[model samples]
Target: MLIVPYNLPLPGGVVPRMLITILGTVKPNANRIALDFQRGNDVAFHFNPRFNENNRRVIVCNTKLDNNWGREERQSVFPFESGKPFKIQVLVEPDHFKVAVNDAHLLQYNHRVKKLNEISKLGISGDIDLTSASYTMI
Candidate 1:
């Protein structure tokens, strides 16, 4: 899995918009890929590709505040379980984020940034082992 954080290019703007992306390939019918976003109590956006012939993508929005343990909001995307490996990409926008899997599926959700100035952090935890993971700010 790859986590990429990019600051929106704004002329003379110190406060930049942040986006985080998680990308990788997973089993074709692999289900229940878990993603955890631990920020200061905000929402989470999840997206993934469908397993059916329609080839449609699914999106889920989780709106739950964090507890003291920093574990309050969690979500999962569809194409839940696949047998072959596919690419998963997550894009975190200012108020929302888009998740795409295998370049075939996509989902978007809204999340509030607690600290507009602080650099966004990402944590990956699940049964799926990532072939590659990266965190970068643009």
Candidate 2:
């Protein structure tokens, strides 16, 4: 199995109407996981799911620009379970990213870093087994 902390290049960067998809399973003992879209040193989007925070599970989405993280957008609706497989879809919209988990609507994160066409990398890390990561233009 391919290990965690995987990073891959997005050949054409990200654009509106692009659909990014990820499939994975959380470890039974998983505490957290992070999925990031990178533009060199800056992170256009940071999608994080935490299982060991505030005595409950939550998803925190944020952006990093010039090494500084912006205001975090927290989602309290949990759609994940430890040791369960999940599917994630991130639809790149003109103004934000519409993310859905397990075929259910999750949350929308507004464009913070804004240079979507320069966001050329995808990074995944922490307590989960990534099965596949792919993208297509819609």
Candidate 3:
């Protein structure tokens, strides 16, 4: 009866040094939560954190274009803790997005869908509670 994969639109558009921030929490038996950068009806960037993966929380990053999913990049060094809160920041650049978790550098992904101007929306979803969600354009 609950929803998953929430989303929100980026006000105006994304640009260099524009930081997209998200704060989310996890609970028991949760699935995954994704920080999504969307353009129109397509998902340009997706950062998903799995709740249980051989007991290791794996952060997966990839793009979905024309219904074909890209090669997912599985990240090491898990960030979020179960039943705890976490924060994520995404910095927009000319070619890729730099991501950080809890103020620590996470990873970067090249823009696959299009440029920053085409990022019409942003949001989160899957297996987590939310406390605060916001962004800063620079």
User: lDDT of all the models against the reference?
Assistant: 0.42, 0.90, 0.79
With candidate 3 superimposed using the best TM-score fit, by how many Å does residue 91's alpha carbon deviate from the native? 1.0
| Candidate 3 weakest ten by summed lDDT | 1-10
Q: By lDDT, who's the top model here? A: 2
Clashes of each: 18, 0, 5
What is the lDDT, from 0 to 100, of the residue 106 in candidate 1?
54
**Pairwise lDDT winner, candidates 1 and 3:** 3
Q: Who is ahead in TM-score, 1 or 2?
A: 2
Q: Which candidate number maximizes TM-score?
A: 2
Candidate 1 per-residue lDDT over residues 1-138, each given as its tens digit: 333231222122112233344544554543334454434343232222334434543423343355322223333455445445545555545665556666754556555444434323334433344555443346
Q: What are the per-residue Cα lDDT tens digits for candidate 2 across 1-138?
A: 456798877886889999988899998988998989999999999999999796889999999889999999999998989999999999999999999999999999989877788999999898888999889988
Each prediction's RMSD over C-alphas, in Å, is 7.8, 1.0, 2.5
For model 1, the superposed segments whose C-alpha errors exceed 4 Å read 1-31, 40-60, 68-77, 113-119, 136-138
lDDT tens readout by residue for model 3, 14-94: 888888777777876777787778877677898888867887779888888877788998888687877887788888888
- Residue 45 displacement in candidate 3 (angstroms): 0.4
